[PDB]
Design a protein around this ligand. Structure first.
Ligand SMILES: O=P(O)(O)OC[C@H]1O[C@H](O)[C@@H](O)[C@@H](O)[C@@H]1O
Ligand SMILES: [Mg+2]
Length: 290
């Protein structure tokens, strides 16, 4: 079967003996890539991560999430030191930590732009779907089934605040948890209004994230590789969503998971197993020989 294979653009399996780069470090998206559809690390993936640690391969989370929600989803693994959150790439790069928890990237949204996005969101009536991200906390203006759905998957609940409190907050990103029915049009409206102003990414399902326009996960990847004196050619990125495209196309070695959109797969060097098929386990086997 094709379930566990990794192949190049021509559909040929990638072979270890044809690789000329040692892979020292793996950057992975969490939801949709490392985590299966139940938001869990599969046992096969876990087993391979244990081997990766034994061999000194670094595995770095690269996510739109804050480090706080990541710890809420995978905390049992973090507590056992099976997955390290420091260094890590959070909020799509806008908060990137080194191993001491220092921010090697801190990209705060300009406050005028924040308020312009806020007012625009109230004008097109998606403000009720907004989750605003400060460094340590998240905020929303109400709770509805879309906010509920975000809370369930995110596993970290925003505080409910009044509209007028946003002005005083210092924010990195906003995430809109949208109804499916308005996603496509809302995405168009945000991209037309905010081009050359902010990044606009449809990250998972109906979620739309806006974050500093010059930052993305690959910027985080470069800083963490720099930290460890690792050439980009010794790094591999794996991902599923729009917010992974820069890191997949920026690294010579990159793997889109089978469940990714064609657009995301196009940006990646190789296509691997789906997130439900233990993708990092097979990446580790192919690139690192386990
Ligand atoms: O960046 P990652 O780790 O792939 O996860 C991204 C996803 O995280 C969670 O599932 C949600 O917040 C989604 O809105 C988001 O798209
Ligand atoms: Mg993802």
């Amino acid at each position: 079967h094709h379930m566990h294979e990794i192949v190049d653009k021509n559909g040929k399996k990638v072979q270890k003996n044809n690789l000329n780069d040692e892979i020292k470090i793996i950057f992975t998206a969490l939801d949709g890539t490392l985590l299966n559809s139940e938001n869990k690390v599969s046992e096969q993936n876990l087993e391979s991560l244990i081997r990766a640690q034994e061999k000194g391969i670094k595995v770095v989370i690269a996510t739109g999430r804050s480090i706080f929600s990541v710890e809420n989803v995978i905390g049992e693994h973090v507590k056992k030191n099976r997955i390290s959150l420091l260094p890590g790439i959070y909020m799509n790069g806008c908060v990137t930590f080194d191993e001491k928890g220092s921010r090697v990237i801190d990209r705060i949204m300009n406050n005028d732009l924040k308020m312009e996005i806020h007012e625009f969101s109230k004008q097109i009536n998606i403000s009720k779907y907004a989750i605003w991200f400060c460094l340590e906390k998240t905020y929303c203006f109400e709770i509805n089934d879309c906010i509920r759905e975000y809370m369930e998957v995110e596993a970290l609940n925003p505080d409910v605040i009044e509209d007028n409190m946003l002005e005083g907050l210092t924010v990195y990103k906003v995430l809109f948890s949208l109804p499916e029915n308005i996603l496509e049009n809302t995405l168009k409206l945000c991209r037309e209004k905010f081009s050359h102003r902010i990044n606009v990414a449809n990250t998972f399902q109906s979620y739309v994230e806006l974050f500093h326009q010059h930052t993305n996960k690959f910027e985080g990847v470069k800083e963490i590789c720099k930290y460890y004196n690792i050439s980009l050619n010794n790094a591999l990125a794996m991902g599923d969503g729009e917010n992974d495209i820069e890191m997949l196309s920026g690294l010579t070695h990159s793997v889109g998971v089978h469940n990714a959109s064609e657009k995301v797969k196009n940006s990646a060097a190789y296509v691997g197993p789906s997130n439900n098929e233990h993708a990092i386990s097979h990446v580790l086997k192919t690139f690192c020989d386990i």
